[PDB]
Amino acid sequence: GSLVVKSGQSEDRQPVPGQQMTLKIEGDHGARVVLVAVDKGVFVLNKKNKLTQSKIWDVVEKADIGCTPGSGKDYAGVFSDAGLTFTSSSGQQTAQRAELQCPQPAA
């Protein structure tokens, strides 16, 4: 969807310790948003193990059942190499898959 967080004050400069400030939040309707503010000084000691949207997709992609950029050796390979199984009443079926992870990256 989309989630943006900008300054409510559509004007002015830098605030002063103790001063209030409007905080605009542009997100999807019906969505719940959890917030958190941290002093940048903390990240100077440690910036690892954070939470990023990019790190999320990186995990989703790793859990993909497809193990080939495309195509295959044969018709039964195209489906399997794309994360699918074909089976017909004529006999044409795909290669039996019985292993969770993708092929061990054999360079």
Binding site: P17, G18, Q19, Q20
Partner: protein, 84 residues
Amino acid sequence: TSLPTSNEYQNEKLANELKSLLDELNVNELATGSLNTYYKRTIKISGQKAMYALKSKDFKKMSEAKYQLQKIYNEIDEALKSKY
């Protein structure tokens, strides 16, 4: 007696306007008792600046303190409307 002169008017008007705010200073200062520390910190500082400027009768300091003291007042007025 007739009338004032060049620096005789503007310098007196600013003094009166600055005094009007200083009168209700204790009013606003005591109004921050329920508000945050920010308002209590800003008004106790902007308070002296208005007093010292008044006795000095310096056009610059009086004006400099007039808006200094006027701003904090308005910030307090708005700080109360969120509380009813």
